[PDB]
Structure 1
Amino acid sequence: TTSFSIPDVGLNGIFATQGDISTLSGLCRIALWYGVNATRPEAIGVGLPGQTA
């Protein structure tokens, strides 16, 4: 495993590799675990233009 340091947005990901001896192959996995939460929905808003009947 290695850290990944996702650019722009401040986030860290994990990049991992494994190998196989039966078949001389390897698997790689880049993953990023996160959860987007809305703590103040009454603060979040939405603007809708052109909402005619």
Structure 2
Amino acid sequence: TTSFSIPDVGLNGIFATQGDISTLSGLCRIALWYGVNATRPEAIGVGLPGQTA
């Protein structure tokens, strides 16, 4: 494994590789672990235009 940086957003992931000798192949995996949590739903809002019956 090694670290993997993501553009734009300031997140860091993991970059892992593995080699298989039998088939002479390689697996590569990029994993990113995060959670988007809204701690104040009363502060988050939504605007809906054109709500006609």
Q: Same fold (TM over 0.5)?
A: yes
Per-residue Cα deviation, 1:1-53 (whole angstroms, up to 9, x for no partner): 11111111110011110001111101000110111111000000000000111
Q: Which runs of 5+ in 2 are unaligned?
A: none
The TM-score normalised by the length of structure 1 is 0.93
Moved beyond 4 Å, runs of 4+: none
Superposed CA RMSD in Å reads 0.7
The TM-score normalised by the length of structure 2 is 0.93
Aligned residues: 53
Q: Which runs of 5+ in 1 are unaligned?
A: none
The structure in which a higher percent of residues are strand is 2
What does residue range 18-29 of structure 1 map to in structure 2 within 5 Å? 18-29=18-29
